[model samples]
Target chain A: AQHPPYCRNQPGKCQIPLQSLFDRATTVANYNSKLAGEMVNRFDEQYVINCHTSSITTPNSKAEAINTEDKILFKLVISLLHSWDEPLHHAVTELANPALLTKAQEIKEKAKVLVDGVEVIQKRIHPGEKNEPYPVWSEQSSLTSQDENVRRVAFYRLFHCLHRDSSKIYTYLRILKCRLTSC
Target chain B: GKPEIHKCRSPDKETFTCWWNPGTDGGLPTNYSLTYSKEGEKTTYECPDYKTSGPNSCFFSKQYTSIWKIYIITVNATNQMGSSSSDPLYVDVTYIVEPEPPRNLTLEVKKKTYLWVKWSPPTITDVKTGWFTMEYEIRLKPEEAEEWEIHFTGHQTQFKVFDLYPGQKYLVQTRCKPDHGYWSRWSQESSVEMP
Candidate 1:
């Protein structure tokens, strides 16, 4: 008889570490603009023209097209954040450290701010107008810039804070593990 | 003669009542007593003698009776012939909370293509708001269609139905479940026409 394939039957088995999952999620969220644009273009080509009667895209039609793209991005980010809750809760309970749990909660609150900020930006974008560019960071220092530049920088800063806090949580978890091993 | 339990129902978490027929009394006056015990407890308690209008019935009410626990209840009948007991009935109170239908269901047009449907929770005295949560499911269908679309709104009494056809009438209905219990019957249907 053939042997059964190796599979995890218990809870928490074969699960990725919470911080590692968050890191990958943040990376995907950071790079999703390109993916969103490509998806929207293909979606429009395949469905929009073929399904609708009008070939001439009016300003309102264009606005609706871009709104569709923003909506996809918004849902993606929301889903990514939502997926973290279960694993994070498990890791916090498993570690059983008050300080680490507090820090994890702080990261959760900051992540909420990031989510809310993305929603605000999504609501502000219009089809015919210039859409807000995805935030990108560089090592070179900048002392000052224009209002739009400042907003972009602030957005990128908030996004990076998710990474920073996530790393801090991982560090605390490692410390807790070390304590458990030592004692 | 053995006692026959006709039916038992629990309307809330705190109380349940069981009714029984005393069977053939053999022309002698018969007395009945109802008793219950929760699972894993050694002590059993007799049902209190609260006078309900319904005949051949007894009520059990107590504080801290868990909705999740299994309870074994029995009805005993005694007369000149002998004493007899009904078969033990096992019940989980959570299944018995058939709450009242939801109320005040209304719809508002949020945007050209979106409609927000909202309703108040069931007015069940057993369920204290804020102490217990509820999950709601909303179903929508075009006014002329028979098939319905269902959406589960976890812990939220309101739902936003999106991408509705413009100027089309849609019928929406909602129902609720106690977070860990069975669902109540659906509320009365509410209809809306999108702009």
Candidate 2:
């Protein structure tokens, strides 16, 4: 195959210096390593604080994804968790019956507000190619003007879900205390 | 599960707490109550006011502080199967040293343009003459005004003011009260102006 104009005809010109390549590789590797290091630092500290201080018991276990969709989901879950109440308690009655589960479902249903916020960030920040197949569950713009409204609704939904989840964590904790005393 | 209770002074001066220990008894939950009396007197007051915590406890607070006294603490634990209370523990409250005012009074102007003021610890005097708890009170007035507006700050010596009138001058001062004692005279007057 023909080389690009910059590399044409001169083998020496086309070839990279081994030392230079090595340096570039080292720079890239260091950059990636540092980024990973920073993320781990943030994640470890946040997870410990969350588990100790609040009701968020789930460990953050996520693999890096290839596309923006998976990345956005990860960001959303992390950010939404910040709103949990202190000393969250889970109840046995609500757990044994459908009462607590129903409440949780209702919270998820109300979370449409925050979801709308996230969609706006996704469409604006990572607008896919014109003819490319859109990722699953992402909003597709029917017209130029519709894009803004779609983003708005999705964002609102996302926050709605997040706020509801936070409030439910608080309510469940209260119920747990009451049952403990009365039982 | 035996109900476990932890008693501590409430953050709000108006009340105290009897919290259920959540981690004990395989993380079984609990509830608590409080009763207290004046030292050397039989007169008693119960914390009629109760509050519930979302996670493993409840709290109660008394309305007044007449004198040091003994407090009776009790807790009840229950699950789907049963409920129970522990033998009441008597805790003595005596010779409490009042906390000190914050130290290093500093002032700043916030975005709204009012005078932001803060202060440092006040030296506290105790029975032994050396134990101290520092606390502070801040009061401010425009240079031309007559009455001083007062604010209380605890443990920290920094404060801020916002929404001040542009070009107006203000004088601010803060004073420290030693533990369980009266306030000291005001510190040197510090001044600030809004642009």
Candidate 3:
């Protein structure tokens, strides 16, 4: 896709931060329950502000929508999410009880499979179909059931899977931001 | 004694002024005459009437100016002791065209922290908007402050400024330059108060 000169020419700048933030997000996602108790969060408010400001500045102009600066900011957001992977994996690996480790490993593996499938679904999204609801396990897979706990687990997987794609779009927006500012 | 041409400047493309020091006057009444000719052409043209109050200066009009060719200017000094001519000065009118000041500057408050500014470019003969590129510099400051924040915009007549203090009045001015030429004087300052 279209990206800023900095992102295109000096991709290492974006990749370094992407890897770091993804690792951080993975840790937060793995221990999301524990962190939720203490009200700690990793989401960036500045990213949202940049998105909103960009939208306002270039209303109805798709050519101007994903400008340089926005593209960089979007990349940063995606990288931030990607950085969560290793931490989440390590958190699951650190379970103390053998039985709990086995159960958590099963759930973690299931989540990965679901997230991978979500990635496939995202690839099928068309350019003009952004308003369409993203495909999820609740709508497409056999994981949806009458039991409340199964649905909850499915919902959890779906959100994590969606974050994978959401992060990518955010990364796209970050690069667009960079382009806008450079111009 | 020979004449020494000191400086030459074209405040507008239509005319230029060259000043010289009639070397030593040789203790006699010296008359200095200025003449110029195109590089390849043999016909020499006398300097137009000297306007500024000085005997050693001459103002040349565009009647003999050709934008594509360089001009060789010479000054001849005559007195009782001796008569001598200075070395020819080669000048290109294109490089000396200093534009007039920018005009019609306006400022509008867009928000509590934003101001919008607009101005008309300098009017130069034969220099249309698309014929040449221009760069502009804008400066702004609080009405009572001595420091000004400066911004440069390439070939744009309008700009938006942000982070202005709400409800405070500011003074804004602008100046412009041809992409390949000298900068014009700053436009008149305009004032606006943020909402």
Candidate 4:
């Protein structure tokens, strides 16, 4: 298989639209949520992940305190996006397939772009404000919790949070773009 | 001002094709060029196959695709009046995976109440792992029935249907879609006679 590297370089590829960049991040977040959702659903059905959603968990997740007004909401997304790679990286150790491993790593790389995008948009919203002290949620250590059920629960909760917050990141990106465009 | 890259699609995720629309030719002959760059990479590359999908489009063969990376693609139109470029489009193969139809479908009459259906998802995809996960639907009808009964089987390659009429031959067809992608065309029909 001839793997052609078209590495000749281009001038137009440099001037990427800010909207498109945000769009890329949004698309990746959406994909990240879908993949995470699939894992949670898969393992949940397998009875491998040892946790249950509360009756209120579905709607209550939507109404969390994180969904604040524009400025705080962007900051909240930045808070959530910055620390996700840790859990995803840890969870990758539990997986065996190179396909999924590479996919997960790729997802992480794209997630980093979104993390970077959120920071950029964060500063754009408050041009003079530097890095705000956003609290990092303690990720349930999936790697250290090597016991089957602990790992399962850790994996489930992390992916479930990923599905939740990554989806949130996509929405926040849209809001940032909309606010920028005054739409 | 420049050629516009219209859309890109991968029906089975193995390969993809992107088409473009031409801008004004200024009454002069024009040539369209398609180039792409991978995400987080500074280098650029040319299209692998322009003729595979015909004029004004690029066809990315499977070998050209490296899964999970975003490809920034643009089309440039050049003529005597000079050239213009479209906005770069980002493509990630994992999310764009609209798989080919489920295949090798077969059915059996396991019992009077159960019609056992078994199938294999498209060969081009990896059903295992989180990559290219597929959800399937099996639609069936008696040979003389007026309406087809559809069952949404979530990621199950095999399913059992209890709804049956005696002495009737039935047709069962299966189709599938990736979790975040488009539904493929219906598979070839597999017929089974009921007890």
Best by DockQ: 4
For B69-161, candidate 1 gives per-residue lDDT tens digits of 457788888888788898887775544655567789999888145788888776653223122335689899888887899999975678888
Model 1 root-mean-square deviation: 25.9
lDDT of 4 at A86: 64
| Chain B TM (all candidates) | 0.76, 0.40, 0.84, 0.86
lDDT for each residue of candidate 4 in B61-170, tens digit (9 for 90 to 100): 76676543567888888888788888877676545656678889988777147888999877777443223447899999988988999999986799999868888899
Off by over 4 Å in 2: A1-183, B10-14, B23-47, B52-64, B80-83, B87-89, B92-104, B107-195
Candidate 2 - chain A - TM: 0.21
The best-first sequence of candidates by DockQ reads: 4, 1, 3, 2
Give the per-residue lDDT digits (tens) of candidate 1, residues A1-183: 433233233553454333443344333333332232233334335330011111212111112222334334344444344434443454345335234345545555555554554444334443333323232223212212335565344324333333322332222222222222220
Worst 10 residues of 1 chain B by lDDT: B124-133
Q: Model 2 chain A, poorest ten-residue lDDT window?
A: A58-67
Q: What TM-score does each of the candidates earn?
A: 0.45, 0.25, 0.48, 0.52
The CA lDDT at A13 in model 3 is: 51
lDDT of 3 by residue, B37-95 (tens): 86445788888777663666887655544442467888998888788998778675545
As a TM-score, model 4 comes out at: 0.52
Model 2 chain B, poorest ten-residue lDDT window?
A: B124-133
Each candidate's DockQ = 0.01, 0.01, 0.01, 0.02
